[PDB]
């Protein structure tokens, strides 16, 4: 009944287990809604997409985690219900937590015989891992295609008439693969900008699995292209002499525009994959369709984070440096005074990566403390339930320590209940006492997060409240802000704001030896979150927020942590804490005068987007770029409103803006329908992770869900003006010298001896021609002595889109023996019909 909504090449399920899931098993479904259970035969439908029972249905993709021995289920009640001998709860019942939204937590659990339980658990665990990996993919167009086809199938396959409208064009059953190809013909033959970019370099001629990448038979190709031409209207690119790109034109493109430097074999490999027409591949070329595919590939999207992973080499510094994701009033779902409080939501915080949470403990109604917003209509919850629901899902994603903040409104005997509950549920996980030798020294410093992997910490008051609870707190003492390392304070929004305004340097230095959290203000009753950037600048680590509001600050917080895998410990800028920095303690972001610093220029070029009005065919898209950051660099922009186009708007406008602090800025690209002012897509991204040269940008909807089809084609260029005589660049002022040394460059040198026309060289910043030349010739000892008749010559050719204009001659210039290469490389601007190359000639 169609394809696999989870493709086979994604799973890792062994044949026996997958076959068992498909065949099914004998299980007892447990209902907690009405305290009922029944005997049912579970199954996994043909497509790895559902779990039917009989009568019912559940969609797997909505799953978020699976648990064994979930205390929510009463084992004894089940045993009595179906008269089965005592069954070990810890290993006889498994749980599903499926929800459509970021708040819904509706469970599904079964209790089955021993091995049946083992099979179902070990199966749905891998299915859940598959789903979690799928939702983290950079490119997901194929997934969208699968969903669309399957949905259209119900009970007939999509018709060409409908497939046309689906992609936005004006009764034969269509195969899925054919369907797929059709989409390709709307992702290449509907990008005029792509062709106009291609005709600047063309000359005349004639992690994620690879298979998933949509664009990575001949007769069908042509029919699909022809049908694409008829349907499209504008910017459409509808046998004689046709151009192409060689192993040298592409190398020019990469050395000059993008910035990538690829050696020969690498570039040949890169050309091998993309070319659709097999005929043109052998000659060593890349036909227009080939260029289109090369640009839209998953190795070309804007950010550096979409394919990131933990950098274990930076999490080894003390705990007082890294930022830390956090939440506020974890249990809450709605207002601060009228709403519910769902325990299961405590997982949404930890699963998404957060490493901090709050406990509003209150005296129990029967001796067991409960959690409720103080003196309101908010419902209550069992404290032990929450404590356990944290433990089970504490370390699914990350393996780095998490800190729980404790608020006490309980009685001392009932606080001892909490003490014992923690000592039981967590046991050794909870840090009990001092751990490391460095702690027992005259100058203690916080241990690094890695040394405490999968641990847990408690923030609360510490005695110099019952002694039992207090003795559990060693590293996070809550002493009201006036050894010092363990004293962590908490400040209300406004208090911290005024502290910053009245004091920059002192507060910042304070953040260099302790933690200091922050939470929204009391006046909020609908949870309008604060813009944390004012706080992040000075070094406030734990900026707690509310995880149920679809608003800008939340997306800012989310994007801030995509880096370093998502483990939520991103090193703070070295300027604040690295003593070796030349601006250490002398940088107050609340200031507005930086005469001793050189701002760097950025040229952003919003070329054109594609399909940036989801479910809105007719409209007037505009793009709002906005540089959130320090008070001195805030600036927004825009482009002209397009008319009745959403498949491929072409604004093609350039914003030039200078910025001062590279490390800590963010961009907020946002579609805006320019007739209702209702943002219909957006995408944030830090400015230290935007790849230069032409790139692609993947958008999102308001909820921060990923939209696949919508995308913006942009070009960024980072220009740094020469540090002429007196002042060092801001980039050099803010950081140390270690980064520049570690930031070595590639240089593509032509004419290197050998068969290959060009041979990359890796060179540091302080590299001149002489050593570079030695690198050209140091390979071989055959030469008796260094012959000076090998001089680099900064060659530069001339061509622009108007091929048929002049075809001027190539400029040339001797290379100064004492000239820095890095400046030469940074001095090439492919804007005037320019492509630099550095060639060795005698």
């Amino acid at each position, epitope marked *: 009944h169609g394809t696999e909504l989870i493709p086979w090449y994604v799973l890792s399920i062994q044949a026996d287990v997958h076959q068992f899931l498909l065949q099914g098993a004998t299980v007892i479904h447990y209902d907690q809604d009405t305290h009922l259970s029944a005997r049912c035969f579970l199954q996994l439908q043909p497509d790895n997409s559902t779990l039917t029972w009989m009568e019912g249905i559940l969609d797997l993709f909505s799953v978020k985690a699976v648990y064994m021995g979930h205390p929510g289920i009463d084992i004894h009640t089940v045993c009595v219900q179906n008269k089965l001998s005592s069954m070990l709860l810890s290993e006889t019942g498994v749980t599903l937590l499926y929800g459509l939204q970021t708040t819904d937590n509706r469970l599904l659990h079964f209790v089955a015989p021993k091995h049946t339980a083992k099979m179902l658990f070990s199966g749905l665990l891998e299915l859940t891992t598959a789903v979690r990996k799928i939702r983290k993919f950079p490119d997901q167009r194929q997934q969208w295609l699968r969903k669309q086809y399957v949905s259209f199938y119900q009970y007939e396959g999509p018709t060409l008439a409908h497939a046309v409208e689906l992609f936005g064009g004006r009764d034969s059953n269509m195969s899925f693969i054919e369907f797929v190809e059709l989409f390709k013909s709307f992702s290449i033959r509907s990008r005029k900008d792509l062709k106009d970019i291609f005709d600047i370099y063309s000359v*005349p001629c004639n992690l994620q699995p690879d298979l998933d990448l949509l664009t990575r038979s001949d007769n069908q190709r042509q029919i699909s292209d022809a049908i694409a031409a008829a349907s499209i209207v504008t910017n459409g690119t509808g046998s004689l002499g046709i151009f192409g790109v060689g192993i040298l034109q592409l190398n020019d493109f990469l050395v000059n525009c993008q910035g990538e430097h690829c050696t020969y074999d690498e570039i040949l490999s890169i050309i091998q994959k993309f070319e659709p027409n097999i005929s043109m591949c052998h000659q060593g070329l890349l036909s227009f369709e080939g260029f289109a595919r090369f640009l839209m590939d998953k190795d070309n999207f804007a950010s550096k984070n979409d394919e990131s992973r933990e950098n274990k080499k930076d999490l080894q510094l003390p705990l007082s440096y890294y930022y830390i994701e956090s939440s506020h009033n974890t249990y809450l779902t709605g207002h601060q005074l009228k709403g519910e409080s769902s325990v299961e939501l405590y997982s949404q915080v930890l699963l998404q990566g957060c490493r901090s949470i709050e406990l509003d403990c209150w005296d129990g109604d029967d001796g067991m403390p409960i959690i409720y917003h103080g003196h309101t209509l908010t419902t209550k919850i069992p404290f032990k339930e929450v404590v356990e629901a944290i433990d089970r899902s504490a370390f699914i994603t990350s393996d780095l320590p998490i800190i729980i903040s404790i608020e006490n409104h309980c009685s001392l005997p009932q606080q001892r209940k909490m003490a014992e509950i923690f000592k039981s549920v967590f046991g050794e996980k909870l840090v009990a006492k001092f751990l490391f030798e460095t702690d027992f020294s005259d100058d203690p410093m916080l241990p690094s997060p890695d040394q405490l992997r999968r641990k847990v910490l408690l923030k609360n008051k510490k005695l110099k409240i019952a002694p039992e609870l207090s003795d559990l707190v060693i590293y996070c003492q809550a002493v009201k802000f006036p050894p010092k390392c363990y004293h962590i304070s908490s400040l209300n929004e406004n208090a911290a704001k005024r502290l910053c305004r009245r004091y920059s340097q002192k507060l910042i230095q304070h953040t260099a030896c302790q933690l200091l959290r922050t939470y929204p203000a009391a006046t909020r009753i609908d949870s309008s979150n604060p813009n944390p950037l004012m706080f992040w600048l000075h070094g406030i680590q734990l900026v707690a927020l509310n995880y149920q509001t679809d608003d800008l600050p939340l997306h800012l917080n989310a994007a801030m942590f995509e880096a370093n895998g998502g483990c939520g410990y991103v090193l703070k800028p070295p300027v604040l804490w690295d003593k070796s920095c030349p601006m250490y303690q002398k940088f107050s972001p609340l200031e507005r005068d930086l005469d001793a610093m050189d701002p760097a220029t950025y040229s952003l070029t919003i070329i054109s987007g594609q399909n940036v009005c989801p479910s809105n065919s007719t409209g007037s898209p505009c793009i709002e770029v906005d540089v959130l950051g320090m008070p001195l660099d805030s600036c927004h922009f825009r482009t002209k409103p397009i008319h009745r186009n959403t498949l491929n708007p072409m604004w093609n406008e350039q914003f030039l803006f200078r910025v001062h602090f590279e490390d800590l800025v963010f961009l907020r690209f946002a579609v805006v329908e320019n007739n209702s002012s209702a943002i219909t897509a957006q995408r944030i991204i830090p400015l230290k992770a935007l790849k230069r040269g032409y790139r692609h940008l993947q958008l999102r909807n308001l909820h921060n869900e990923i939209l696949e089809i919508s995308s913006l084609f942009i070009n960024s260029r980072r220009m740094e003006d020469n540090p002429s005589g007196s002042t060092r660049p801001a980039s050099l002022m803010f950081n140390t010298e270690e980064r520049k040394c570690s930031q070595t460059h590639k240089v593509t040198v032509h004419g290197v001896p050998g068969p290959e026309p060009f041979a990359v060289f890796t060179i540091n910043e302080g590299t001149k021609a002489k050593q570079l030349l030695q690198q050209i010739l140091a390979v071989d000892q055959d030469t008796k002595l260094t012959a000076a008749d090998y001089f680099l010559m900064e060659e530069k050719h001339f061509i622009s889109k108007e091929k048929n204009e002049c075809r001027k001659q190539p400029f040339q210039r001797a290379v100064g023996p004492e000239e820095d290469i890095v400046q030469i490389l940074n001095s090439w601007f492919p804007e005037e019909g320019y492509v630099g190359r550095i060639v060795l000639k005698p």
Partner: antibody
Amino acid sequence: EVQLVESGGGLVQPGGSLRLSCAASGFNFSSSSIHWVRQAPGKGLEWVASISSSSGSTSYADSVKGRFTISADTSKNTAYLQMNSLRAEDTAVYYCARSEYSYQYVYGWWYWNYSAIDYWGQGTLVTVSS
Amino acid sequence: IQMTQSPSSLSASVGDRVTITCRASQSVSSAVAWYQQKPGKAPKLLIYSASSLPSRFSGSRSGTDFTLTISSLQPEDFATYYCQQSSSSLITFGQGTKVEIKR
């Protein structure tokens, strides 16, 4: 100012292999198409091949495909027409000449045609006697 | 592709008009020239497309006919004349025609 020196022709038995080079200068070889055209004595003119240099795409005639191999070296600004298993009718004069293209792009992509054979080399003779 | 260079040869008195017929098997747009070669030397160019540069040479076309016209014949004009086109990349030549003096 354009100079096209072609050398390497001569005599060789049937079935022999041979190559004719054509040095150039003045005009940027990297942006110009090189050629070879031959003339058996007392007969018309015959086109040999066409190598677009940087592009690499090559186009031989419909009479001697194969045994004639065409290559180029943009770095050295030379060309190389490698001939394999020479036959009797290889006995003729070999001429190397550049050319240029006149792009004629239409409502769509761009197109390119050879326009003007505006130079020729001095001339070299290849003979095959058995 | 095909080319024609009729007539193959002729003889004329100095100062007269010379006309050469070079017809193609099919329309080849405007890719036709006229190359001259004195014996013992590499040929040379005269014309690309229609005319364009020799002071009395010209070229005009009619349907599928490409013509070279010399307004006034000159003595040194004794040489061979070729017509060659270029479809996409296929250098084809005419039969070649020879011009001399008559007595």
